[PDB]
Amino acid sequence: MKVANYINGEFKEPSTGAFQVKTSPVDGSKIAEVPRSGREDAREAIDSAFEALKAWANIPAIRRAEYLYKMLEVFRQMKEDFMKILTVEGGGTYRKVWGEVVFTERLIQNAAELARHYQGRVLQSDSESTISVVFKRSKGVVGVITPWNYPLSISMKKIAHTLAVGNTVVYKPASDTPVTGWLIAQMVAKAGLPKGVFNLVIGPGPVVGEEIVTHKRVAHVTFTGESSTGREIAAKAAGTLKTVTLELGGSDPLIILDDVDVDYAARLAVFASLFHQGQICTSAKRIIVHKAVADKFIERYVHYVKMLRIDDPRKDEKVDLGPLINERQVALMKEFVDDAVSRGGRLLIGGRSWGNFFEPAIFVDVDRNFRIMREEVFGPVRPIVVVENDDQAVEVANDTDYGLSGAVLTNNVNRAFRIAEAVESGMFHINDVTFLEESHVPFGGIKASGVGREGGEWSFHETTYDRWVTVTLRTRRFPIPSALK
Amino acid sequence: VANYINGEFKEPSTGAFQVKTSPVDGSKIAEVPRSGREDAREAIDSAFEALKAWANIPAIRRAEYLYKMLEVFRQMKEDFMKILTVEGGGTYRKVWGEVVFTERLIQNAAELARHYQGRVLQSDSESTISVVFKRSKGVVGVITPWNYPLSISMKKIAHTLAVGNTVVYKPASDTPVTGWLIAQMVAKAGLPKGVFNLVIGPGPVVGEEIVTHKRVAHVTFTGESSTGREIAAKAAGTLKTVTLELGGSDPLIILDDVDVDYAARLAVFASLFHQGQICTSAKRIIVHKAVADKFIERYVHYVKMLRIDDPRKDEKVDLGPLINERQVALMKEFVDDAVSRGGRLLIGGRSWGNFFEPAIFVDVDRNFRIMREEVFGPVRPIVVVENDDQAVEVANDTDYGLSGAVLTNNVNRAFRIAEAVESGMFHINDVTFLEESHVPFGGIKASGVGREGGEWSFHETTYDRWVTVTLRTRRFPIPSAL
Numbered sequence: 001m002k003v004a005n006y007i008n009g010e011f012k013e014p015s016t017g018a019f020q021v022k023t024s025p026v027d028g029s030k031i032a033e034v035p036r037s038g039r040e041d042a043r044e045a046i047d048s049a050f051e052a053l054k055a056w057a058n059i060p061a062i063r064r065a066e067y068l069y070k071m072l073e074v075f076r077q078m079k080e081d082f083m084k085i086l087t088v089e090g091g092g093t094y095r096k097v098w099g100e101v102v103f104t105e106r107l108i109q110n111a112a113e114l115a116r117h118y119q120g121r122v123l124q125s126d127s128e129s130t131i132s133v134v135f136k137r138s139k140g141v142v143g144v145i146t147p148w149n150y151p152l153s154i155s156m157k158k159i160a161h162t163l164a165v166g167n168t169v170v171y172k173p174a175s176d177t178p179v180t181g182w183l184i185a186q187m188v189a190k191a192g193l194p195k196g197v198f199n200l201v202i203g204p205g206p207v208v209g210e211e212i213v214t215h216k217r218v219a220h221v222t223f224t225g226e227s228s229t230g231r232e233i234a235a236k237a238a239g240t241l242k243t244v245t246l247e248l249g250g251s252d253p254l255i256i257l258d259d260v261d262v263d264y265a266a267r268l269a270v271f272a273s274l275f276h277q278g279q280i281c282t283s284a285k286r287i288i289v290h291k292a293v294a295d296k297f298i299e300r301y302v303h304y305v306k307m308l309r310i311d312d313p314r315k316d317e318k319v320d321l322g323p324l325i326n327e328r329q330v331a332l333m334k335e336f337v338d339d340a341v342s343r344g345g346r347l348l349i350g351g352r353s354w355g356n357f358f359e360p361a362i363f364v365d366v367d368r369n370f371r372i373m374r375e376e377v378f379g380p381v382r383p384i385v386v387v388e389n390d391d392q393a394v395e396v397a398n399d400t401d402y403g404l405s406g407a408v409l410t411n412n413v414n415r416a417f418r419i420a421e422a423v424e425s426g427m428f429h430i431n432d433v434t435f436l437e438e439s440h441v442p443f444g445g446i447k448a449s450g451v452g453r454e455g456g457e458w459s460f461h462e463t464t465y466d467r468w469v470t471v472t473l474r475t476r477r478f479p480i481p482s483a484l485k
Numbered sequence: 486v487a488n489y490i491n492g493e494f495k496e497p498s499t500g501a502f503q504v505k506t507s508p509v510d511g512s513k514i515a516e517v518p519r520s521g522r523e524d525a526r527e528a529i530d531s532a533f534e535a536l537k538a539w540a541n542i543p544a545i546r547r548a549e550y551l552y553k554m555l556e557v558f559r560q561m562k563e564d565f566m567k568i569l570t571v572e573g574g575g576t577y578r579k580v581w582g583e584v585v586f587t588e589r590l591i592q593n594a595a596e597l598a599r600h601y602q603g604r605v606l607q608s609d610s611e612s613t614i615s616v617v618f619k620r621s622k623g624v625v626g627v628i629t630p631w632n633y634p635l636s637i638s639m640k641k642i643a644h645t646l647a648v649g650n651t652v653v654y655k656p657a658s659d660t661p662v663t664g665w666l667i668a669q670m671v672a673k674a675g676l677p678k679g680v681f682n683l684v685i686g687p688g689p690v691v692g693e694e695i696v697t698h699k700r701v702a703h704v705t706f707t708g709e710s711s712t713g714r715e716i717a718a719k720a721a722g723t724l725k726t727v728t729l730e731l732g733g734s735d736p737l738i739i740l741d742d743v744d745v746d747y748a749a750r751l752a753v754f755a756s757l758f759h760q761g762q763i764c765t766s767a768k769r770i771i772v773h774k775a776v777a778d779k780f781i782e783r784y785v786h787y788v789k790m791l792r793i794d795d796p797r798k799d800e801k802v803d804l805g806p807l808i809n810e811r812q813v814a815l816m817k818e819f820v821d822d823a824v825s826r827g828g829r830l831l832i833g834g835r836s837w838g839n840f841f842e843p844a845i846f847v848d849v850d851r852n853f854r855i856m857r858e859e860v861f862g863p864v865r866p867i868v869v870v871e872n873d874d875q876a877v878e879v880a881n882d883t884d885y886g887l888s889g890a891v892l893t894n895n896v897n898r899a900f901r902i903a904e905a906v907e908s909g910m911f912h913i914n915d916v917t918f919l920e921e922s923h924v925p926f927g928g929i930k931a932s933g934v935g936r937e938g939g940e941w942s943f944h945e946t947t948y949d950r951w952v953t954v955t956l957r958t959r960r961f962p963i964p965s966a967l
């Protein structure tokens with residue numbers, strides 16, 4: 001493996017020559033040397049994107065769609081490679097990476113499918129002889145900055161859709177997941193997109209990302225990452241007046257009412273709260289249970305969590321949980337655990353950590369002052385709070401700074417709709433996991449969870465703009481100068 | 486003169502007042518609040534409290550409220566006209582226009598309130614219904630300019646209200662009385678307390694509070710590009726969304742196949758109406774060489790006819806004053822810079838008090854301040870060009886993206902130019918400032934972020950909520966043993 005940037009149709013070394021050694025979060029073994037890019041690399045890619053822009057944006061939608069279809073067929077051949085890399089570099093299990101690769105395939109196809117169909121409007125004019133219509137135009141070069149947790153699918157959801165609608169792209173993957181980025185670039189290359197239409201530069205955020213965010217020729221930034229970093233990017237984007245899409249994380253309520261199949265509720269709870277070691281923006285990070293089922297629920301949930309198998313994700317396809325992405329995550333989780341213990345929480349199970357591995361720590365007897373109720377816990381530490389009624393459930397659910405997703409388990413149509421209605425989130429799910437995601441549906445939060453929506457036409461929307469154009473067919477008198485005649 | 490907060494008119498908490506004066510004769514118009522952070526915070530908390538009640542009711546009830554606002558506005562028309570003239574310096578034709586348009590705006594918000602639709606989606610999963618709902622953003626700050634303070638304020642306010650948001654509104658300091666009249670209208674319409682709030686104070690204090698505050702979900706702003714940039718940056722802190730209208734230097738491109746006389750009348754109206762203080766004003770006129778001489782001749786000929794006077798004098802007055810002495814000073818700089826760079830002054834150049842005559846220039850180039858900057862005032866460059874590519878090159882060479890226009894009878898040239906000009910809006914054979922109440926009004930580049938009017942306003946102030954219901958039980962991948 002020789003991992004490189006990809007700029008203007010060419011796999012290229014960083015101008016610096018710098019390299020970081022990317023190692024596996026699993027055993028710490030070396031994975032590959034990867035670029036450590038600077039501001040000049042970013043600048044090169046940006047200019048490549050700005051020169052490719054006109055040619056790319058002015059061909060008909062169908063041509064771009066043919067490119068995305070080509071991308072799809074290339075990706076299908078690269079599936080196993082993507083999976084291996086997602087497991088080795090990202091710590092994903094077989095099931096996590098299979099799921100992500102499938103979803104990625106779907107995403108690419110989706111952008112392809114929608115490319116020809118993104119429509120403007122024909123309007124009624126309040127004026128006499130006037131054609132009034134509204135066109136969709138692509139924004140420009142779009143910066144795309146992505147996280148390490150689902151680096152493939154998140155990256156591709158932004159890239160594929162942004163490309164489809166006539167934007168070009170410069171893409172900086174997460175520092176912990178460079179090889180995934182590189183592989184995306186291999187796909188785009190093998191698909192033969194025109195040079196400069198898609199550019200990959202692997203480098204540290206404060207350098208590469210900073211340039212992408214401040215550059216004059218960058219039209220838009222779409223960013224999935226930490227909420228603070230997103231506030232930074234948001235503020236710095238204001239200088240050049242570039243728009244932004246920001247997915248800043250969540251702390252999603254999973255609310256289980258008293259009429260549920262409690263065993264089923266526990267199975268669901270375990271999947272939604274702990275999948276990918278809980279590193280999912282839509283993870284069910286706060287579990288809220290009705291007191292009538294609370295004890296039986298807690299006992300069952302813990303029973304199933306106990307069942308989870310944590311191991312090297314390379315071993316076989318049945319491993320439930322691989323490691324956390326890095327040492328920093330384990331440390332942070334240890335902070336959350338320390339906080340909860342010191343605040344009087346019962347640690348029902350887990351907390352054991354070796355290397356980057358962390359066995360899920362479940363807590364009860366928690367209150368709203370716990371760090372794990374007040375912060376997004378991106379990792380395998382879960383509170384379970386007990387509530388007396390639907391109102392309290394809702395109160396606790398909305399008791400966060402986050403807005404992303406949420407879910408309620410119940411068979412009662414009124415309680416389901418009332419809670420759904422009252423929960424403040426960009427997304428809500430009745431009788432499913434908090435992390436439900438489809439390729440074409442608006443995905444995003446309110447509150448501290450972010451700004452904008454992605455997937456399908458919502459992504460098209462983030463990366464295009466309305467252009468109001470009229471044609472006046474008749475001659476008019478004008479109010480000045482009033483002396484006319 | 487009365488901030489409006491939580492259903493009542495009241496003093497600012499500082500008690501600090503300020504004298505506001507007519508740009509026309511400089512006479513005293515009213516004493517108005519100088520509000521502080523606390524005033525804003527109070528308006529905001531009131532908006533926030535009123536929010537759940539206002540958002541949750543059916544849209545038809547809000548529409549009803551807007552129809553009441555409509556009825557009241559119709560009663561208050563001459564009050565609004567009067568104030569727009571005396572405090573704003575608008576001529577009778579311009580204030581009549583703004584009022585007629587504001588009426589259409591309120592009616593439009595009311596009309597559309599019941600109609601803003603989410604989507605029903607096809608799901609890729611078995612046994613799941615998947616839909617998307619619209620939801621109001623929250624309390625919304627509305628910060629407006631002095632040039633069209635009524636119609637701009639009301640486009641923002643009415644549409645934001647229609648769709649279930651609460652408003653905290655801080656009018657341009659140069660037009661506080663118009664703000665007050667709006668609050669008067671809202672109060673007489675009887676909207677629930679906290680739904681709409683007016684606080685009159687300085688931008689860096691009241692506006693800063695609005696833009697940095699926790700409970701404000703969104704800010705829609707119309708004003709200086711620099712101020713807009715600041716607001717966009719400070720917005721980041723709380724992750725609040727912004728709509729930003731930052732003005733333009735709109736190209737008006739005149740080709741050689743046009744009726745030249747007509748092209749000139751159009752050009753004069755588009756470039757100079759309301760003393761050229763209009764975001765979509767035709768600020769840079771671009772003529773094809775073949776018609777250029779006769780065009781210039783005729784344009785100047787009509788400019789000659791423009792009556793500047795006390796806009797109170799009568800209904801045929803073409804131009805009133807600028808808004809303040811600062812604008813005169815700036816216009817003076819633009820003219821002096823153009824002359825000093827060897828620009829040929831074809832006509833005008835005199836100022837008195839707040840009045841400034843149209844100053845028209847030719848033989849300019851791209852380094853002139855009147856080509857490089859938004860000239861919000863009656864100073865206009867006319868640039869002669871050899872061909873369409875050059876028309877477009879000059880049209881695009883500017884930081885601004887707002888609007889634009891081309892006069893021509895050739896369909897291909899019209900459409901080539903319309904596509905090539907980088908602007909958020911474009912008009913073939915009409916003025917650059919065409920505006921309808923239901924259209925996506927906004928620019929690109931330095932002209933701003935977002936669109937307003939109709940569903941586009943609703944859009945700036947709402948979000949999509951994806952909701953699913955899953956009807957089948959599922960098997961889960963972890964734990965695998967299970």
Ligand code: NI
Nearest residue numbers: 461462944945
């Ligand atoms: Ni939008």
